[PDB]
Design a protein around this ligand. Structure first.
Ligand SMILES: Nc1ncnc2c1ncn2[C@@H]1O[C@H](COP(=O)(O)OP(=O)(O)OP(=O)(O)O)[C@@H](O)[C@H]1O
Ligand SMILES: [Mg+2]
Ligand SMILES: [Zn+2]
Lengths: 512, 314, 84
């Protein structure tokens, strides 16, 4: 604040900083930023205080449960620094109100997010604003810090990482190998009975499966939603028809069909102890019934969203998953465990975050001292690596000349049949999926620049069904996907190819 | 479980990490922490959140100015009061479940009996003499001992758990019983660089160890740590101490670059945070008896961003 | 205890959780194949891992010989945590 020393303290005081997220890392970060000197800080978060956040996020107290993180955050902080000039936004960072001009305001940006999706959006914004971005993360005892600067280092997407964990409908509906396969199976089943029927998230055995070259809200409502009726169709009839496909069942252990009748013939935490098949079969019936009773209160026509903190919902998935596992000779797991998996809960503790945040400010001080080339990705280990290092520091790498984002003139070639691929498969399986674009604005880079897809609703709605050829798109065509909010453009070279493969809509040139 | 239903939700995330039994052992441990400065507060807060049975913050020093913008556990207007008490309230709110107590007597006068009421002692800002003294009392009374400080972009943490036996986990999950042995702090600070096991490691040994030496001497010869308010005066004396101390251990003063005096003054918040979380996590491992503790020194250098675990003394 | 292509040296890739997976790679091969072999086995997104050797990052085109990888050399592995 007063000793750190002159030229540095100058920017630390006047400079304006932005912190994205006020959870574990966030709170610790604020405490430091402020104590270190930074007085002009802008906070942003889209969540409310939870009683579980009370073991690390010390800016919050029991009395603040339910309130806005960002809000309370500012309050708490202003206590041990009344002179602090803070501004908190209780809202998502994905919000279009926070455009490049907003980001270009700050001299430094720090992320404290808990998902790739946000990290991606923030990564691009800072590139567009060309403002230093300090990216971090933690998990249990592990965690890391790194710096990102357009043109200088690699961006958070020079080596693309998944925003979510995708699973093949094959091993999910036909051959579950990991316990997670059953829990996911359970979730679809949940979204197929009480939620939005997702065609992709089916549940019944698939006939058009590669492994076994063969020769469910329907069943639900047709049977009046009877647990027993269902049980026998999900853990007996379906499994039986599953065995019918002796192709997919060659060397791999075959499932064991169940029967509601037979089944009914048998200190850690309450939710840590596992129960017996029957006990779950009954929970399976008890949950379903209780679920529909709740869904009967939610207006008329309202669907249900699965939530790890919803008891009845947790009971269903827990039970459904275990029953599914038993059938596949996989050992059943407790509720506490299935909760973490179905809810992707990330084990968090204060110390681990407290470390990362300290490191963040340290890299920031360097960056503001014009010592960016001294910054580096730091890793926090649990046990000292062979060199006695608990905190592993490694240099920052240069931009990837083939990154689909930070590159100078992002461009790529997409091979696919311009006669079979619909305008939707483009805006969904390619532009949004592969290239990772949430708000696409594709157009044909031709003499007229035809608009094929628009981000704004009620415009390019009547095209999702049409064929790409219908728009004159052909071999050699050049498409331009844009995301103005992020000032991101991606030239897409179309390379027509009919005889490409099976079930392979398209394919980017550079993958295997 | 065997813990409050409420507590089951408040500690859920950490329970999903080190397990319910660990939290229990932690819920049944009292910690003594002396020195309520940056590192102090950081440490206090980390434990109070963790959920220990109770924490006693000892400090007889007054709340001198320049504390508000360095200590978040004190009120903007508390200049002139006891550093410990001043932190009480806020620290206490961090987590009601824990009983935070405050003592205001010079740790030196304290009788061996006073220390037997705690499960782990953690000192800060103390002089070597006080450090060895407490480390010695704890040993004879079978008490986990921790100490550590911060200076500029550097900081350190030491541990002496004696005959420490714990349980790890390597696999379905299976616990395994391992045992580790620590040594006196005096033996760690006074190493013989003539031994073959020494000279044959002095190379791979972080100079931060010798940095601590020099500064420890400073705290002794003088009655405070170096200060920017007296940079030149202190800088001159420091380099000198480097020569004196090092010309004794039998090593060249080169091992500690003369520029070391540029990055070792005052208390840097981010440093306290880093060092504090590391120390506080070691205390928790020792109290929950889960996972291998760092034997036995930990040196942090904010400049290069390195966290080294050294083992000196044996 | 789990080769890839050729044969000459046995490397041991240790992670942050103390896990180990010994490998036997061809003295002169794109280490990018071990990284693939690793994430394939460990079952984790390739791009989420960063392999290191004595401080330096193992470039996809790097090879044991160019790095001076002998026998029993330990390759460190680090994963990007995503909890905020
Ligand atoms: N798009 C986003 N915009 C603003 N804040 C976000 C965004 N995504 C995540 N966050 C915030 O990131 C923070 C992540 O921190 P953290 O994981 O500790 O919180 P959390 O949701 O309580 O975690 P958990 O519930 O898994 O224990 C949260 O405070 C969350 O609201
Ligand atoms: Mg979160
Ligand atoms: Zn890039």
């Amino acid at each position: 604040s007063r000793g750190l020393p002159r030229e540095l303290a100058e920017a630390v005081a006047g400079g304006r900083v932005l912190v994205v997220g006020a959870g574990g890392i966030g709170c610790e970060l604020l405490k430091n930023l402020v104590l270190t000197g930074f007085s002009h800080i802008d906070l942003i978060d889209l969540d409310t205080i939870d009683v579980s956040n009370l073991n690390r996020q010390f800016l919050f107290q029991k009395k603040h449960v339910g309130r806005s993180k960002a809000q309370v955050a500012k309050e708490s902080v202003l206590q041990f620094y009344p002179k602090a000039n803070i501004v908190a936004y209780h809202d998502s960072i994905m919000n279009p109100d926070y455009n490049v001009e907003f980001f270009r305001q700050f001299i430094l940006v720090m992320n404290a997010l808990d998902n790739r999706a946000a990290r991606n959006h923030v990564n691009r914004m800072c590139l567009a604003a060309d403002v230093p971005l300090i990216e971090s993360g933690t998990a249990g005892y592990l965690g890391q810090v790194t710096t990102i600067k357009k043109g200088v280092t690699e961006c958070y997407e020079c080596h693309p990482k998944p925003t979510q964990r995708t699973f093949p409908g094959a091993t999910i509906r036909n051959t579950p190998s990991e316990p997670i396969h059953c829990i996911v199976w359970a979730k679809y089943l949940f979204n197929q009975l009480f939620g939005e029927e997702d065609a992709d998230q089916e549940v019944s055995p698939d006939r058009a499966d590669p492994e076994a070259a063969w020769e469910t809200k329907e069943w639900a409502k047709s049977t009046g939603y009877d647990p027993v009726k269902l049980f026998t169709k999900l853990f007996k009839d379906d499994i039986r028809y599953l065995l019918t496909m002796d192709k997919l069942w060659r060397k791999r252990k075959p499932p064991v069909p169940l029967d509601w009748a037979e089944v009914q013939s048998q200190l850690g935490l309450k939710d840590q102890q596992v129960l017996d098949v029957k006990s779950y079969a009954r929970l399976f019936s008890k949950s379903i019934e209780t679920l529909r009773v709740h869904l009967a209160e939610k207006g008329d026509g309202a669907e249900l969203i699965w939530d790890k903190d919803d008891p009845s919902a947790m009971d269903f998935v827990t039970s459904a998953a275990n029953l599914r596992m038993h059938i596949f000779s996989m050992n059943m797991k407790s509720r506490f465990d299935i909760k973490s998996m179905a809810g992707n809960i990330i084990p968090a503790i204060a110390t681990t975050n407290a470390v990362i945040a300290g490191l963040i400010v340290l890299e920031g001080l360097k960056i503001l001292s014009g010592k960016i080339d001294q910054c580096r990705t730091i890793f926090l280990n649990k046990q000292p690596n062979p060199r006695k290092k608990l905190l592993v520091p490694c240099a920052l790498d240069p931009p990837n000349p083939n990154c689909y984002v930070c590159a100078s003139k992002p461009e790529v070639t997409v091979r696919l049949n311009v006669h079979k691929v619909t305008v939707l498969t483009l805006q969904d399986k390619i532009v949004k999926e592969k290239f990772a674009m949430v708000a696409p604005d594709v157009q044909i880079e031709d003499g007229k620049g035809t608009i094929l897809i628009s981000s704004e609703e009620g415009e390019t709605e009547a095209n999702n069904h049409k064929k790409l050829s219908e728009f004159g798109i052909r071999n050699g065509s050049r498409l331009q996907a844009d995301d103005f909010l992020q000032d991101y453009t991606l030239l897409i070279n179309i390379l027509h190819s009919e005889d490409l493969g099976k079930d392979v809509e398209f394919e980017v040139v550079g993958d295997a | 479980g065997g813990i409050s239903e409420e507590e089951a939700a408040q500690y859920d995330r950490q329970i999903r990490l080190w397990g319910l039994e660990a939290q229990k052992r932690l819920r049944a441990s009292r910690v003594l922490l002396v020195g309520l400065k940056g590192l102090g507060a950081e440490i206090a807060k980390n434990l109070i959140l963790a959920g220990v049975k109770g924490l006693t913050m000892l400090d007889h020093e007054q709340v001198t100015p320049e504390d508000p913008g360095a200590q978040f556990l004190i009120r903007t207007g508390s200049v002139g009061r006891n550093r410990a008490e001043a932190s009480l309230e806020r620290a206490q709110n961090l987590n009601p479940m824990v009983d935070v107590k405050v003592d205001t007597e010079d740790i030196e006068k304290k009788p061996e009996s006073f220390f037997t009421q705690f499960d782990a002692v953690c000192l800060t800002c103390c002089s070597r003499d006080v450090i060895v003294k407490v480390d010695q009392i704890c040993h004879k009374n079978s008490i986990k001992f921790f100490t550590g400080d911060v200076f500029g972009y550097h900081g350190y943490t030491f541990a002496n758990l004696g005959e420490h036996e714990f349980v790890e986990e390597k696999t379905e999950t299976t616990m395994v019983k391992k045992k580790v042995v620590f040594c006196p702090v005096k033996e760690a600070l006074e190493v013989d660089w003539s031994s073959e096991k020494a000279k044959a490691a002095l190379k791979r040994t972080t100079s931060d160890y010798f940095l601590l030496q020099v500064l420890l001497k400073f705290r002794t010869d003088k009655g405070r740590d170096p200060s920017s308010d007296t940079y030149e005066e202190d800088s001159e004396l420091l380099l000198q101490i480097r020569n004196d101390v090092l010309d004794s251990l039998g090593i060249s003063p080169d091992l500690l670059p003369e520029d070391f005096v540029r990055y070792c003054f005052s208390e840097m918040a981010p440093v306290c945070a880093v060092v504090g979380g590391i120390l506080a996590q070691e205390i928790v491992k020792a109290l929950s008896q889960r996972d291998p503790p760092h034997n036995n020194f930990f040196f942090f250098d904010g400049m290069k961003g390195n966290g080294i675990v050294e083992c000196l003394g044996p | 205890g789990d080769k890839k292509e050729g044969e000459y040296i046995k490397l041991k890739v240790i992670g942050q959780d103390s896990s180990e997976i010994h490998f036997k790679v061809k003295m002169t091969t794109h280490l990018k194949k071990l990284k693939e072999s690793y994430c394939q086995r460990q079952g984790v997104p390739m791009n989420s891992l960063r392999f290191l050797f004595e401080g330096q990052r193992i470039a996809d085109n790097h090879t044991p010989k160019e790095l001076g990888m002998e026998e029993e050399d330990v390759i460190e592995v680090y994963q990007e945590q995503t909890g905020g």
